[PDB]
Ligand SMILES: Nc1nc2c(ncn2[C@@H]2O[C@H](COP(=O)(O)OP(=O)(O)OP(=O)(O)O)[C@@H](O)[C@H]2O)c(=O)[nH]1
């Protein structure tokens with residue numbers, strides 16, 4: 001049997017959690033904004049020559065319900081928007097929650113600076129993300145675009161690789 | 166305004182949680198799901214409710230109020246709403262000649278006659294079905310007749326009428342569901358079973374009626390026929406509304 005991977009996409013409202021997930025799963029860019037309550041997806045992918053079943057939880061941007069998916073989740077994508085400084089600042093608290101709930105520091109994680117196609121609206125320079133990754137003991141870090149498809153697959157594949165290690 | 170979070174399950178076990186207010190019809194939830202799932206929007210897509218305890222299931226009709234249907238569910242319910250393709254749901258509108266016992270022109274004439282006149286015409290369906298005895302793994306073959314208002318039968322000793330046909334059940338009082346695993350559970354002669362139950366009933370009850378059919382075709386005929394009788398012109402309008410989105 002192929003291994004199953006429970007992945008959780010986290011971050012503040014409007015950063016592109018849903019857009020990244022739908023681009024990855026269905027190859028469609030979601031232009032219309034509708035705030036998520038909870039969406040889940042199942043997709044079979046090949047990672048390092050092996051078939052993998054990915055269970056992806058696309059979470060609400062804005063309790064006990066948060067604790068549960070952190071307890072259950074195996075890998076976490078912490079997403080901010082490069083166009084919104086506050087969404088970047090919000091991520092420290094999310095990380096702290098995860099590590100506390102998991103009761104460990106070694107949790108599969110990736111820092112994702114989304115909307116990298118909107119270069120003219122950039123507020124969060126790539127060096128901020130790199131510095132945060134450094135603070136988090138060399139946490140995986142990528143800049144992505146759900147619209148252009150840049151580094152979309154890489155987000156989820158990297159989490160699988162971290163879970164495998 | 167009453168709001169309800171409804172977790173919708175897809176066939177691949179993916180899910181979408183939607184905020185559904187008290188004014189939403191199944192039609193509205195479907196329109197939302199068409200947008201969110203990026204599906205092909207064909208007329209077979211529907212909301213489908215499953216009752217794991219009773220092991221029954223049915224399509225929502227598109228005009229049904231979603232919050233109202235779910236209001237009957239218990240606090241710790243196992244029931245689920247699914248988003249699935251069910252090609253039987255509008256079978257009469259694609260192939261009316263299969264129920265009213267053909268080219269496009271004559272199909273259209275048949276639907277005009279059956280749905281677009283002063284009153285609907287229900288298929289002239291009758292036949293034997295097996296009726297489960299209350300609380301027993303026992304079945305009795307009986308002859309039933311479909312009418313606009315309900316299912317009828319000829320009282321023991323008397324025959325074809327007129328105002329002497331006794332009513333078995335009135336459709337205003339029940340929803341119609343598929344019965345699952347009735348052969349294993351209740352010794353139904355086949356697994357081609359339909360169930361008539363008041364919407365409120367969520368657990369075993371003498372008032373749930375179990376009907377078993379000799380074959381799949383008979384089941385299809387009765388489920389479609391009963392839905393026509395119960396929902397009438399509304400079902401036709403639902404179909405026209407669905408075609409417009411396809
Ligand atoms: N230009 C551009 N727009 C994006 C990108 N990703 C998301 N968006 C847009 O940003 C808006 C919000 O995206 P969502 O994916 O719905 O945001 P979210 O993080 O899921 O928001 P919540 O579910 O409310 O937490 C939508 O209008 C998207 O089309 C991207 O990479 N580039």
Ligand SMILES: [Mg+2]
Pocket residue numbers: 017018019034035036058059
């Ligand atoms: Mg979202």
